[PDB]
Design a protein around this ligand. Structure first.
Ligand SMILES: C[C@@H]1O[C@H](OP(=O)(O)OP(=O)(O)OC[C@H]2O[C@@H](n3cnc4c(=O)[nH]c(N)nc43)[C@H](O)[C@@H]2O)[C@@H](F)[C@H](O)[C@@H]1O
Length: 255
């Protein structure tokens, strides 16, 4: 019934959620549905959201098991063709939703754009098998996925409390979900555990890898590490998966 659905997970977001809603409602050229999924905010968050009361806004307010649990609740209730996810501290740039609708009007299931973090562009990678040995290739809040994309790929894995977004995009890549990357800015806004989750996601792609080998690949793709052992890993596991070989050949063409 809508062109776009925007899911906004919130908890104690009274300080910015108004700006976020303002950045969405001022988008021209599209019919939009907004689903706010609140984890039971004790502050004014709900009172600010109701100030934007409209027929195309839905408020859920109940306890949940985290950001991706609230995201799953909102995606499940989405009624628009393309679904995006926006945090209360983020904002969409002008005309971004019309761009999404036009690019998706060709049947592409994912439309992703650039992300502005502290006045710098996110160091994006390509949406391709080479990302399966890295992280999420583009900002998650800059991504719009169709109803079909979610229906085929599924919901976010709550086992990953940090990198559930990267894991979902990696499942979309593996499912051959079509993706179009627009070179325009769409959104502006325990590290060892981040590394552990990233390596576990990579292992879910290639279950034959040890954790240290996945970490080596990750750092190699992200320019954080060395690449002298890549040929050793390829010869060792190349027989296991053609997709593993393709990911290594795209990431390290010198090999
Ligand atoms: C939006 C996400 O953000 C992630 O990283 P990020 O660093 O931005 O986390 P952040 O906490 O700053 O924002 C989280 C947003 O959900 C709200 N929030 C926080 N905790 C809870 C909770 O328990 N329950 C419910 N219902 N909402 C909660 C918070 O108010 C804010 O609106 C990205 F990795 C990810 O791809 C995604 O884009």
């Amino acid at each position: 019934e809508f062109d776009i659905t925007v899911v906004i997970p919130t908890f104690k977001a009274e300080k910015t959620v108004g700006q976020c809603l303002e950045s969405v409602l001022s988008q021209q050229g599209v019919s939009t549905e907004i689903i706010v999924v609140d984890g039971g905010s004790p502050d004014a968050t709900i009172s600010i959201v109701q100030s934007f009361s409209s027929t195309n806004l839905t408020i859920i307010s109940e306890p949940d098991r985290g950001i991706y649990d609230a995201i799953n609740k909102g995606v499940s209730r989405a009624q628009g063709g393309m679904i995006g996810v926006l945090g209360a501290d983020d904002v969409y740039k002008p005309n971004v939703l019309s761009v999404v609708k036009e690019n998706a009007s060709r049947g592409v299931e994912i439309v992703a754009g650039l992300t502005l973090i502290d006045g710098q562009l996110r160091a994006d990678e390509q949406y391709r098998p080479a990302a399966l040995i890295s992280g999420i290739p583009f900002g998650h809040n800059a991504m719009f996925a169709s109803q079909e994309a979610y229906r085929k790929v599924g919901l976010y894995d709550l086992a990953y409390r940090i990198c559930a977004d990267a894991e979902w995009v990696h499942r979309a890549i593996k499912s051959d979900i079509s993706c179009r990357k627009v070179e325009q800015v769409f959104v502006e806004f325990n590290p060892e555990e981040i590394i552990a989750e990233a390596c576990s996601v990579i292992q879910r792609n290639f279950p034959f890898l040890l954790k240290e080998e996945a970490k080596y690949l990750l750092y190699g793709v992200r320019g954080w590490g060395e690449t002298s052992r890549i040929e050793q890993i390829l010869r060792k596991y190349g027989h296991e998966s053609v997709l593993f070989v393709t990911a290594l050949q795209e990431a390290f063409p010198a090999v």
